């Protein structure tokens, strides 16, 4: 069966069908990127729920209870789904995208798209077509955010990714596999460790992304882990200066070194009342990676 964790079993040039899907949200967006941050191809991600999948709370987990899907051509996607202000206005385009995914459901066509992370080649789901389907029964996502509008978002924002990063204080934290992290599916609050090889580290403007592997990557679910840093204080601490300055090949210099990370779970807003779970390294600095890199 097509499942958010089943890309290693997917075949190339083969179209796969998500019937009756809810587009939960998308990154980037107005909640993570204020200002009209010009959206490039392949850097727009969407997150899709099917009602067969577990529904724990307003925090969804990619590769578990939602699909992370790359948009290969934004203009076609916005044109086909019903967006009308692109590319003149990024802000109004995403506002229009929000109204359409909040109200409708879609049949979605995806395929296993090969792509490179630095030198390694891996897979990712890419969107091919989107088709509005007729309205109707009840909607668990709509019920969930109706409860969320009454109750406290405050507790979820306690785990927002920009909140400054502190050690939880777990006694003798345990080293863990990437699989085990992917199966770590609620919001636990405890320090966990992982030992992994740096595939690449990207400066994305207002966040830093670190691709990690334990192993061409046949099974990105089991063997690839994306780790991110958000926020002024967190980023300032990573670079060692408040301007996010660094030399070009300092990020390159870290590729290939095995690094032990301590992670805590954080939360990224993808819609007004919906979030995805992410992992963040604790007290990471380019400094120490760089100094360790020379070893």
């Amino acid at each position: 069966d097509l499942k958010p964790d089943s890309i290693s079993k997917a075949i190339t040039d083969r179209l796969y069908h998500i019937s009756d899907g809810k587009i939960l949200g998308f990154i980037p967006n107005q909640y993570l990127d204020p200002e009209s941050s010009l959206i490039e191809d392949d850097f727009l991600l969407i997150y899709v729920y099917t009602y067969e999948l577990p529904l724990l709370s307003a925090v969804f987990v990619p590769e578990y209870n939602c699909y992370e899907i790359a948009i290969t051509n934004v203009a076609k996607f916005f044109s086909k789904i019903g967006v009308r202000s692109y590319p003149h206005s990024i802000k109004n385009s995403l506002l229009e995208l929000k109204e359409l995914i909040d109200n409708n459901r879609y049949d979605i066509t995806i395929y296993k798209k090969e792509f490179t992370i630095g030198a390694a080649k891996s897979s990712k789901w890419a969107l091919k077509d989107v088709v509005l389907r007729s309205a109707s029964g009840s909607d668990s996502i709509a019920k969930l955010e109706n409860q969320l509008k009454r109750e406290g978002v405050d507790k979820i924002e306690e785990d927002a990714a920009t909140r400054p990063i502190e050690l939880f204080g777990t006694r003798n934290p345990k080293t863990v596999d990437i699989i085990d992290i992917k199966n770590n599916v609620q919001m636990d609050h405890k320090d966990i460790k992982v030992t992994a090889k740096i595939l690449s580290i990207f400066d994305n403007g207002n966040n830093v992304t670190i691709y990690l592997t334990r192993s061409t990557i046949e099974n990105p679910f089991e063997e690839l882990l994306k780790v991110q840093i958000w926020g002024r204080q967190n980023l300032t601490l990573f670079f060692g200066n408040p301007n996010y300055s660094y030399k070009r090949e300092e990020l390159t210099a870290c590729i290939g070194s095995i690094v032990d990370f301590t992670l805590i779970p954080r939360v990224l807003r993808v819609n007004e009342y919906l979030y995805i779970k992410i992992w963040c390294p604790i007290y990471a600095t380019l400094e120490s990676l760089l100094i360790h890199s020379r070893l």
Binding site: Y51, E52, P54, G137, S140, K143, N183
Partner: protein
């Protein structure tokens, strides 16, 4: 009152108890069957508690049963299956590893997982469910089929 239907009766009593409290006296479940003594009989009752403890779904004193792991395992079953009922999904294929990994109870057996799901499908009142069927398809997977009165 066959041996394996005594195990169904105890396991269901433990499940209902574990939603109220995470603890109960060791013999309280045996007490709720017999009103709602031979030493050979309740040995069989304690041999069953030992088998459940061998899988870590409960732990045991000489005084009380700790149903914490049962509580959090059954809470996931409620969460998972109440979600499917409200959308009125006709059938679902489920991996046993899904429940073990969510609860971190990797010694849970196929038989025990099907019994807990079956118990919920007999128990729940919310939704329009009125019939169901469970297929023990494979070593890793089982199917559950749902039937509803309204649409």
């Amino acid at each position: 009152l066959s041996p394996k239907q005594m195990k169904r009766e105890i396991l269901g009593v433990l499940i209902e108890k574990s939603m109220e409290s995470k603890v109960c006296k060791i013999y309280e479940p045996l007490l709720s069957i017999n009103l709602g003594e031979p030493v050979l009989h309740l040995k069989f009752y304690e041999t069953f508690l030992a088998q459940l403890a061998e899988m870590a779904i409960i732990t045991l004193d000489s005084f009380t049963i700790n149903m914490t792991n049962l509580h959090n395992c059954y809470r996931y079953i409620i969460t998972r299956f109440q979600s499917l009922i409200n959308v009125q999904i006709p059938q679902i294929t489920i991996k046993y590893s899904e429940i073990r990994n969510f609860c971190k109870l990797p010694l849970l057996s196929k038989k025990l997982i099907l019994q807990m799901c079956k118990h919920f499908l007999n128990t729940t009142h919310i939704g329009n469910l009125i019939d169901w069927w469970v297929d023990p398809t494979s070593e890793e997977r089982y199917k559950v089929f749902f039937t509803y009165s309204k649409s």
